[PDB]
């Protein structure tokens, strides 16, 4: 509703931590923030041969999960915009605010 967040990360611990940060500092100055809704956690898969020259019949498999989290804000106020676009922690987590 005319303001909403999106957060991607590789660790759900950091993800939930920052989601609680934003939810708390949002409902401190406003009201009615839709919960941190979870999204379905994309996954990839990489198979590789673990030997430099021969032996195709023995491999090692890797992956990279990407956790997702959604937060929608209802009825912002000329102070929520301020108190939201300023908090920034932590480092390796993607934030994308679309109106």
């Amino acid at each position: 509703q005319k303001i909403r967040i999106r957060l991607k990360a590789y660790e759900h611990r950091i993800l939930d931590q920052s989601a609680d940060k934003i939810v708390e500092t949002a409902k401190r100055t406003g009201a009615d923030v839709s919960g941190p809704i979870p999204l379905p956690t994309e996954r990839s898969l990489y198979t590789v041969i673990r030997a430099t020259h021969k032996y195709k019949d023995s491999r090692e498999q890797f992956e990279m999960r990407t956790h997702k989290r959604l937060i929608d804000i209802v009825n912002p106020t000329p102070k929520t915009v301020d108190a939201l676009m300023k908090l920034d922690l932590p480092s390796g987590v993607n934030i994308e605010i679309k109106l």
């Binding site: 198979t47 019949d57 023995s58 491999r59 498999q61």
Partner: protein, 128 residues
């Protein structure tokens, strides 16, 4: 009205079943169970809980099913119908319990391993 709801799972398929007093009939996904699963006789697998306990009518059955194949999502329907019958009267948890009809079948598709043709079939060998 009064109604009874249960949830049934089998082999990548999940069903949502509703028991309602009536005259004995079942419709699934807005079609008739004679047409939705018209295979041969899987219906006689579905109507087994009514056959063993709460013998045998009369409830119209309304189900919402999605996932798996035609033979998985009928064992799932059976699972759900049994759970719903259990909900009606708890005294049924013995006759049903004796004849299976209450457990989830945890027989899923085994995963493929590398270096093998399938989950367990290996390549052809030659001693020389």
């Amino acid at each position: 009205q009064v109604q009874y709801s249960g949830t049934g799972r089998r082999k990548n398929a999940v069903a949502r079943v509703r028991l309602v007093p009536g005259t004995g009939k079942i419709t699934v996904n807005k079609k008739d169970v004679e047409e939705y699963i018209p295979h041969a006789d899987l219906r006689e697998v579905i109507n087994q809980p009514f056959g063993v306990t709460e013998t045998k009518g009369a409830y119209d059955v309304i189900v919402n099913v999605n996932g798996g194949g035609y033979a998985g999502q009928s064992g799932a329907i059976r699972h759900g119908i049994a759970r719903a019958l259990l909900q009606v009267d708890p005294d049924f948890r013995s006759a049903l319990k004796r004849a299976g009809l209450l457990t989830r079948d945890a027989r899923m598709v085994e995963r493929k391993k590398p270096g093998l043709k399938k989950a367990r079939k290996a390549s052809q060998f030659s001693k020389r």
